Amino acid sequence: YDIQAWKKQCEELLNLIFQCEDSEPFRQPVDLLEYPDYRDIIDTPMDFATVRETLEAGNYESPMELCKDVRLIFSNSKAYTPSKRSRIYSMSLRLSAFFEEHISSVLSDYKSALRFHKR
């Protein structure tokens, strides 16, 4: 029932994601010189460095906020890909599976702790 424990759990999950080869396209903002039409398709850019900086600044109030920004990384990849068989999109699907498998217990433990607080 620790209402604060989600933050270190999210820091350690971001560390695993940065060690994964599949995160490399997603670590920094998409390069607009490399992809000159990017902002014609994508209204809200997002990347893992932005997620980690928002967490370390104390600008997430809950793990659900962090989960919404990480899911935006993956939806941007799906919207920008020219093909469902593209290399970078394929990397996004593996990394999304890994993220969802790990964030499940973080969300469950937080929501249980808050229900206990408010009992």
Ligand X SMILES: COC(=O)c1ccc2ncccc2c1
Residues 109/1, Cβ–Cβ less than 8 Å = no
Maximum Cα interatomic distance, the chain, rounded to a whole number of Å = 53
CB of 85 to ligand X, least distance (A): 9
Helix/strand number for the chain, H first, E second: 5, 0
Q: Look-up: residue for tokens 């995160």?
A: 23
Binding stretches for ligand X (CB under 6 A): 25, 30, 35, 77, 80-82, 86, 88-89
Residues 44/72, Cβ–Cβ less than 8 Å = yes
CB of 40 to ligand X, least distance (A): 14
Residues 22/87, Cβ–Cβ less than 8 Å = no
Residue (35 or 116) nearer to ligand X, CB: 35
Residue (30 or 106) nearer to ligand X, CB: 30
Residue (33 or 57) nearer to ligand X, CB: 33
Residue (20 or 107) nearer to ligand X, CB: 20
**Which structure tokens are listed for 106?**
């973080």
CB of 79 to ligand X, least distance (A): 9
CB of 60 to ligand X, least distance (A): 23
